[PDB]
Amino acid sequence: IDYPSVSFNLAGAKSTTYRDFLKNLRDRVATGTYEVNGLPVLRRESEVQVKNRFVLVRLTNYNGDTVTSAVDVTNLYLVAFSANGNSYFFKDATELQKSNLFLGTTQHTLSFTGNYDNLETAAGTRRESIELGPNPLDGAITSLWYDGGVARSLLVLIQMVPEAARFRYIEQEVRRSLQQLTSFTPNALMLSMENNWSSMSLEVQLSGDNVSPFSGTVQLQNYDHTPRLVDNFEELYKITGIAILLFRCVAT
Amino acid sequence: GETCAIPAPFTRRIVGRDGLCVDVRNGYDTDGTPIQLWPCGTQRNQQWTFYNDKTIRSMGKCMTANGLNSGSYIMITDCSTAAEDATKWEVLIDGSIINPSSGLVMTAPSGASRTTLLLENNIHAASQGWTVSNDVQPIATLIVGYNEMCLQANGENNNVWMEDCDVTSVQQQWALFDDRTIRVNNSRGLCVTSNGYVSKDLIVIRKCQGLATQRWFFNSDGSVVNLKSTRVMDVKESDVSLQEVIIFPATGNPNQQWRTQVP
Numbered sequence: 329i330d331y332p333s334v335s336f337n338l339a340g341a342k343s344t345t346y347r348d349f350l351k352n353l354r355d356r357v358a359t360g361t362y363e364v365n366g367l368p369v370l371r372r373e374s375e376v377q378v379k380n381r382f383v384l385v386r387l388t389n390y391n392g393d394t395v396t397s398a399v400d401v402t403n404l405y406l407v408a409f410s411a412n413g414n415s416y417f418f419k420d421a422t423e424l425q426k427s428n429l430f431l432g433t434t435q436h437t438l439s440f441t442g443n444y445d446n447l448e449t450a451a452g453t454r455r456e457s458i459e460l461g462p463n464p465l466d467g468a469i470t471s472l473w474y475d476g477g478v479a480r481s482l483l484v485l486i487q488m489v490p491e492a493a494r495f496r497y498i499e500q501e502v503r504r505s506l507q508q509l510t511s512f513t514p515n516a517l518m519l520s521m522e523n524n525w526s527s528m529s530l531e532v533q534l535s536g537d538n539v540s541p542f543s544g545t546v547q548l549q550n551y552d553h554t555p556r557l558v559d560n561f562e563e564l565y566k567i568t569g570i571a572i573l574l575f576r577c578v579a580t
Numbered sequence: 581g582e583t584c585a586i587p588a589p590f591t592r593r594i595v596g597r598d599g600l601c602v603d604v605r606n607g608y609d610t611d612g613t614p615i616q617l618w619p620c621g622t623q624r625n626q627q628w629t630f631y632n633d634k635t636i637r638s639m640g641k642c643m644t645a646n647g648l649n650s651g652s653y654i655m656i657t658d659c660s661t662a663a664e665d666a667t668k669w670e671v672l673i674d675g676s677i678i679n680p681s682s683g684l685v686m687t688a689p690s691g692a693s694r695t696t697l698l699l700e701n702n703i704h705a706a707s708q709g710w711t712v713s714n715d716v717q718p719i720a721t722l723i724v725g726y727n728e729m730c731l732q733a734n735g736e737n738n739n740v741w742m743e744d745c746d747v748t749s750v751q752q753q754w755a756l757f758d759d760r761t762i763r764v765n766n767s768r769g770l771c772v773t774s775n776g777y778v779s780k781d782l783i784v785i786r787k788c789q790g791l792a793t794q795r796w797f798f799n800s801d802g803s804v805v806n807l808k809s810t811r812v813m814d815v816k817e818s819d820v821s822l823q824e825v826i827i828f829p830a831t832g833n834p835n836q837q838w839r840t841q842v843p
């Protein structure tokens with residue numbers, strides 16, 4: 329199926345051109361009226377057809393060489409990506425994505441799932457040192473285009489798009505990155521909220537709509553690595569700048 | 581489908597003015613004891629438990645209202661005997677604790693230590709702003725709005741416009757108090773105030789007093805909307821050169837979007 333897609337060319341790209349891109353990417357995966365406090369809640373396997381099961385992301389590198397990675401509308405996960413008659417799928421790869429994504433290219437699966445821990449272990453490094461930004465993005469798309477697509481470059485993308493798609497904090501972190509044309513490395517906070525998507529997810533659905541207090545607490549992390557426990561929604565938003573909620577439970 | 585889950589009780593603090601915490605007088609678990617603002621601290625009278633039934637309480641004595649009528653104060657008394665209605669409370673994301681049955685909200689006439697609280701006619705004021713949380717410590721942040729520029733605070737009674745982001749200038753260091761008010765970190769004496777409720781109304785950095793203008797609700801869409809008047813703060817005609825942030829009917833445009841970045 330000709331799944332919808334968005335584009336973002338690093339060349340002649342400004343901060344606003346990036347912000348708008350993520351916005352469009354959100355307007356797709358973020359549909360349905362199941363939302364709380366305004367923030368939408370990504371659908372689930374049952375309430376979603378294959379015809380709209382996946383979305384395609386188009387990223388054009390400096391040299392024009394553009395690579396595309398399809399995200400899962402049910403979690404903003406990077407399902408796969410293609411490059412010049414070539415397609416790749418993590419060690420998992422379901423027949424759903426293997427028989428509906430980039431049909432026509434070589435379907436050679438990699439050897440590691442899209443799990444953050446999996447990628448890091450394959451790249452021999454961790455997110456806390458895989459600097460992201462304008463140039464880092466270029467090397468990412470490029471590497472995935474020629475080298476066939478390694479783990480490192482992959483991690484560079486995930487945090488740059490889906491991650492910045494749910495967390496506006498990473499958004500401005502990147503918007504400022506291209507603005508000053510400088511790179512940067514993920515801090516303890518960005519990484520903290522990066523691992524508490526599912527946690528804060530139900531922690532917001534638990535309280536319910538138009539509710540501030542949380543039934544529990546979110547284990548965030550400050551720069552000094554110290555624990556930052558957020559008990560209210562207003563706090564979670566004013567810090568993580570979340571804008572996308574993953575399904576965990578339904579209203580009561 | 582997949583029903584959620586009934587949440588168990590939890591003990592969280594309460595604040596809503598001058599960084600003052602809500603607690604019971606002398607922490608006396610006796611009935612009738614009223615509620616009042618008082619500097620936060622590790623103590624039961626300051627500790628509050630929330631239940632599914634919609635009841636908040638400390639020391640095991642339900643936090644119920646004393647007499648029902650716009651102007652009545654609050655106090656603690658046994659749950660059982662407590663008036664079925666004068667015991668339930670609602671805490672919306674608007675930073676307000678409104679009493680269902682009645683419709684009044686926990687108001688704080690004056691943000692002074694040892695000041696007793698009291699239900700009143702909800703009019704959307706800093707006084708009627710409360711944020712339940714164990715972390716009574718606000719968070720430092722810069723409001724990056726239009727063209728990746730940060731909101732800057734000039735002089736007292738002066739305006740407030742978008743200046744080149746600088747993570748060093750204290751004028752850009754905004755402190756978000758639990759009372760739903762935005763005060764300058766350098767000097768938490770003045771709060772972001774408006775000059776009216778009509779479109780194009782100019783914004784400034786007036787003093788803090790709990791005025792309905794000093795109330796700012798951070799809409800999840802990314803816009804800092806004013807509660808009293810549905811208007812939202814933005815950049816006049818987008819021209820940052822004009823040097824002025826004002827209230828204006830929502831449009832859903834980027835010139836009305838604001839981000840709050842950590843320290």
Ligand SMILES: *[C@@H]1O[C@H](CO)[C@@H](O[C@@H]2O[C@H](CO)[C@@H](O[C@@H]3O[C@H](CO)[C@@H](O)[C@H](O)[C@@H]3O)[C@H](O)[C@H]2NC(C)=O)[C@H](O)[C@H]1NC(C)=O
Nearest residue numbers: 717719720721750753754755764765766767768769842843
């Ligand atoms: C925002 O402004 C407030 C003040 O209006 C700052 O609060 C306090 O600032 C001091 C100075 O940085 C912090 O440490 C202090 O260090 C001195 C020197 O050792 C010491 O004498 C003081 O007793 C205090 O420990 C202080 O921790 C901090 N907050 C509190 C609750 O004490 C605040 O730091 C400003 N925020 C930012 C991001 O600048």
Ligand SMILES: OC[C@H]1O[C@@H](O[C@H]2[C@H](O)[C@@H](O)[C@H](O)O[C@@H]2CO)[C@H](O)[C@@H](O)[C@H]1O
Nearest residue numbers: 603604605606607616618623625626694
């Ligand atoms: O109402 C204000 C304030 O009262 C304190 O009550 C006592 C306190 O319990 C006692 O330990 C101290 O010696 O004297 C105080 C006299 O007010 C409460 O402890 C405090 O929480 C506030 O509730």
